[PDB]
């Protein structure tokens, strides 16, 4: 139509060039918690046995109840300055990965 459109090769080259400069680290404490969470979620959602799923759901509910009970005492834990920065960067990386 007389217009130019980018392809996957151009996107790959642009990604390489952009990653040449300073780029966000993925070898971080966060995105380790993320992979652990995703692995546990996949393990729960992949099992065919319903009893195992029920037991895992009950255990998660128990842990959430314990956390809520602790919070009721006022034990809500802010993460950190640097920890918050790292989590924000991790989330930004994960979100940016959605358009590849």
């Amino acid at each position: 139509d007389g217009r130019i459109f980018a392809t996957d090769a151009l996107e790959v080259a642009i990604t390489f060039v952009e990653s040449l400069d300073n780029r966000f680290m993925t070898s971080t404490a966060s995105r380790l918690s993320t992979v652990q969470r995703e692995i546990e979620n996949l393990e729960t959602r992949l099992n065919p046995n319903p009893a195992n799923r029920v037991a895992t759901l009950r255990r998660r509910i128990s842990e959430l109840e314990r956390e809520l009970q602790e919070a009721e005492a006022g034990h809500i834990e802010v993460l950190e300055t640097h920890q918050a920065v790292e989590h924000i960067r991790d989330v930004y990386n994960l979100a940016s990965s959605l358009r590849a």
Partner: protein, 46 residues
């Protein structure tokens, strides 16, 4: 087995000589074209 080491080199050579991304990167004018294209496509995708 060195096959994983010779077919790998063949694949790398083929990609270097054929894949548009590596061809553009190796081109001695790559920075100018890359900057122009990135600037053009940063604003519009239609």
């Amino acid at each position: 087995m060195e096959e994983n080491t010779r077919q790998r080199t063949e694949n790398y050579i083929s990609a270097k000589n054929q894949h548009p991304a590596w061809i553009l990167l190796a081109t001695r004018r790559a920075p100018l074209v890359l900057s122009c294209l990135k600037t053009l496509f940063e604003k519009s995708h239609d």
